[PDB]
Ligand binder design. Structure first.
Ligand SMILES: [Zn+2]
Lengths: 255, 217
């Protein structure tokens, strides 16, 4: 399914439980974890952090922990494939996915019990409608039409799952969540900025989308750091300050 | 002339606020005053020297760490005269046996790429340089008068507290006593002295352009 609001559907369910966090290995996912951590250590929510690196290790990890816990969270892993089969879970287990990969697999979208998605649907998504891809002579006369339906399905799949790309970074969804609760700080803003900058560094998003997201984040940066308008002389020098720069493209030139 | 000391009394005050305020460490863990603590812990042991780092000086006040690269002679003095006014408000009251404030030799290191002896063109005259090498010699330590006092010969007039300049440069004794032409001699009883050596630095072996004997400084 698609989570409509993150407060009352994702957070305030796992708020009183013992969750298990699977984490991929990329700067985007690291910065998307380090905010969720700080959002759990603030409300005394027992979590557990398992660093995975592939599908074999994710399966091995799900093998051992799949009876103690019955909540799960996957971060930048498992939104472009099908989930209810590679893991083969039980019925009363819940999965949250907060991945960037695209496009989201089909069944993961029409499965509104076990695989919830924290993906803001206002991204570049065009998921096919429901029945377009999911289920005497008159018998054959109509089962030929169902065969036509299957033939259309074999094509619309090839239409939809042919190009892979990336949406808004995880460390921005998590930051939207952490701002809703009114528990955002600078330290949770720097990790948002880094988790965004990393995609543009590794060239997985378009310059248009990058500048749009920078335009978003600058309002937050100014909301936090502008409150020190003229008191920048009586603020402690040992306290982080984030600033917007129009700066060179040379790599690491300051060191 | 009159703006000279008025600038200095404003530099010797910004070099003092650097030692007195520069901290390290973040806000999550906890901080540490880096140079007050070393001044105190080196004074109480009886060492009298700190090791200021140029990156810190740059990151605190950007103008000072530039003057220090351009006019190191007449600014190291202000630095070493502020290190002495900070080491006073940190260790006092000194217990019993010492109550005269010593003098703090401010060394300084850096993390910057080194030049080489073959790259000392005359446009680098009186600029901080940073060169590697290999010690090749070592003189025996000697004295070097720092604060000297003279006396006339005939009329026995004194003119004391005269301060020598550092480095290898002497002093020009007057000839106008206010007595014969040069009536002034040195009073050996009243002249503070400090040690000084003189080494000899040879250039690294893997940087000779390979036709000759390495040069030294
Ligand atoms: Zn005389």
């Amino acid at each position: 399914m698609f989570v409509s609001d993150f407060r009352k559907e994702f957070y305030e369910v796992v708020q009183s439980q013992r969750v298990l966090l699977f984490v991929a290995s990329d700067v985007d996912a690291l910065c998307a974890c380090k905010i969720l951590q700080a959002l759990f250590q603030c409300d005394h929510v027992q979590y557990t952090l398992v660093p995975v690196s592939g599908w074999q290790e994710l399966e091995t990890a799900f093998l051992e922990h799949k009876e103690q816990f019955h909540y799960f969270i996957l971060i930048n892993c498992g939104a472009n494939v099908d989930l209810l089969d590679i893991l083969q879970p039980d019925e009363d287990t819940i999965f949250f996915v907060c991945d960037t990969h695209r496009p989201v697999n089909v069944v993961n979208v029409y499965n509104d019990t076990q695989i919830k998605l924290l993906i803001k649907q206002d991204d570049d998504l065009e998921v096919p409608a429901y029945e377009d891809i999911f289920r005497i002579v008159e018998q054959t006369m109509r089962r030929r039409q169902r065969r036509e339906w299957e033939a259309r399905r074999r094509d619309i799949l090839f239409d939809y799952e042919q190009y892979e790309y990336h949406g808004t970074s995880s460390a921005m969804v998590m930051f939207e969540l952490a701002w809703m609760l009114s528990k955002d700080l600078n330290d949770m803003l720097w990790w948002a900025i880094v988790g965004l900058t990393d995609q543009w560094v590794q060239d997985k998003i378009t310059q248009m989308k990058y500048v749009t997201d920078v335009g978003v984040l600058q309002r937050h940066v100014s909301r936090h750091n502008h409150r020190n308008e003229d008191e920048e002389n009586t603020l402690s020098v040992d306290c982080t300050r984030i600033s917007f720069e129009y700066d060179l493209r040379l790599v690491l030139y300051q060191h | 002339a009159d703006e000279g000391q008025a600038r200095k009394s404003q530099l010797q005050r910004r070099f003092k606020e650097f030692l007195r305020q520069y901290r390290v460490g973040t806000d999550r863990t906890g901080f540490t005053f880096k140079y007050r603590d070393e001044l105190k812990r080196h004074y109480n042991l009886g060492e009298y020297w700190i090791e200021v780092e140029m990156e810190d000086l740059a990151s605190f006040d950007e103008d000072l760490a530039d003057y220090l690269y351009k006019q190191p002679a007449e600014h190291l003095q202000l630095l070493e005269e502020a290190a002495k006014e900070v080491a006073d408000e940190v260790t006092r009251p000194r217990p019993s046996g010492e109550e005269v404030l010593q003098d703090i030799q401010v060394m300084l290191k850096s993390d910057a790429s080194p030049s080489s002896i073959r790259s000392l063109k005359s446009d680098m005259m009186s600029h901080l340089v940073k060169i590697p090498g290999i010690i090749i010699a070592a003189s025996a330590v000697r004295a070097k008068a720092t604060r000297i006092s003279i006396q006339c010969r005939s009329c026995r007039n004194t003119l004391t507290n005269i301060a020598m300049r550092p480095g290898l440069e002497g002093y020009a004794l007057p000839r106008k006593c206010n007595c014969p032409l040069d009536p002034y001699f040195i009073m050996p009883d009243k002249c503070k002295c400090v040690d000084f050596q003189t080494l000899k630095l040879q250039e690294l072996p893997d940087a000779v352009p390979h036709g000759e004997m390495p040069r030294h400084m």
